[PDB]
């Protein structure tokens, strides 16, 4: 009985996601809502994404450079600079600035629609919310996560190059020539898969929590907080699983 | 305002997919030059 309580919400989320997939592959797509939600997520989670990605990659590059300079092998730093940035820094900054901003925004928007009885207004008009609202939001979440992951990886690599060369006086040719030493097609492919899955899961969780808001006076805030916590936990677990799968393939081996 | 939103989304998507394609080109070792195919015979390729 103790496990049966969260299992009901788990089943509701899973059934809602199954219906979302069915509406995506069966019913006509909502291009207008998809465009609107894509631009909304981009405008709500682009500047924070850079503002979190730039200092974090600078910190990682600084730590790697000092540790390797003491180690003596300061010419292979770019290798690590690539290896983290493609496979962990990109998807994890995507996790943070998607779950914090876009997932919470989707949950708040759908909760606002629910408490204002707009969902019931759609439902009494014969329309299905899962096809008109959830599908464009999940697709927009996936698209924005993909693009943001690409931008994060690129900006992180460039910032690491500039910091290491112009501050810690490492050699630029060693940075650019060692980037591909440990990173190849498997790493960028697993990064793309991570970003796509993270965006899809964040969109699904945000939509499901927004549709099932409790109203009241703290229901929307509680729903947003629960959305954020669930997204962080689920995306970290999925990142662990996908990291294991990706290192099973490997560029070095 | 859907036209302007489409314009902005298209430009932003083009730039960020250019970045993703650039990452794929850089880390996938993609070349765009015309090449001719030759063959060679080795007793041992030494891990090539």
């Amino acid at each position: 009985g103790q496990l049966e309580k969260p299992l009901a919400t788990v089943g509701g989320f899973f059934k809602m996601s199954v219906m979302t997939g069915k509406a995506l592959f069966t019913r006509p797509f909502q291009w207008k809502e998809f465009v609107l939600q894509s631009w909304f997520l981009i405008r709500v989670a682009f500047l924070p994404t850079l503002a979190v990605s730039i200092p974090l990659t600078v910190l990682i590059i600084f730590t790697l450079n000092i540790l390797l300079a003491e180690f003596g092998a300061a010419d292979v730093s770019g290798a690590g600079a690539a290896l983290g940035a493609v496979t962990q820094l990109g998807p994890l900054v995507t996790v943070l600035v998607v779950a914090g901003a876009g997932s919470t925004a989707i949950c708040a928007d759908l909760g606002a629609r629910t408490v204002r009885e707009e969902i019931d207004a759609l439902e009494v008009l014969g329309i299905d919310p899962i096809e008109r609202l959830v599908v464009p939001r999940v697709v927009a979440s996936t698209f924005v996560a993909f693009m943001l992951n690409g931008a994060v990886i690129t900006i992180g690599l460039v910032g690491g190059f500039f910091f290491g060369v112009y501050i810690q006086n490492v050699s630029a040719g060693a940075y650019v020539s060692t980037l591909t030493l440990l990173t190849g097609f498997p790493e960028v492919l697993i990064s793309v898969v991570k970003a796509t899955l993270f965006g899809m899961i964040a969109g699904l969780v945000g939509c499901y929590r927004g549709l099932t808001v409790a109203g009241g006076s703290k229901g929307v805030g509680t729903a947003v907080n629960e959305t954020l916590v669930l997204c962080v936990v689920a995306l970290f677990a999925v990142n662990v699983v996908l990291t294991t799968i990706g290192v099973r393939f490997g560029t070095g081996r | 305002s859907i036209k302007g939103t489409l314009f902005k989304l298209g430009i932003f998507s083009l730039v960020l997919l250019t970045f993703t394609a650039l990452i794929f080109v850089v880390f996938g070792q993609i070349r765009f030059n015309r090449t001719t195919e030759y063959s060679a015979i080795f007793k041992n390729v030494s891990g090539l």
């Binding site: 060369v165 112009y166 630029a172 040719g173 650019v176 020539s177 980037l179 591909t180 | 080109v25 850089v26 070792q29 070349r31 765009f32 030059n33």
Partner: peptide, 17 residues
């Protein structure tokens, strides 16, 4: 594009020379 030899073979700004 045609002469693209890699990110390691592109001239970089800064440094001596």
């Amino acid at each position: 594009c045609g002469q693209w030899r890699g990110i390691a073979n592109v001239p970089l700004p800064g440094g001596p020379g």
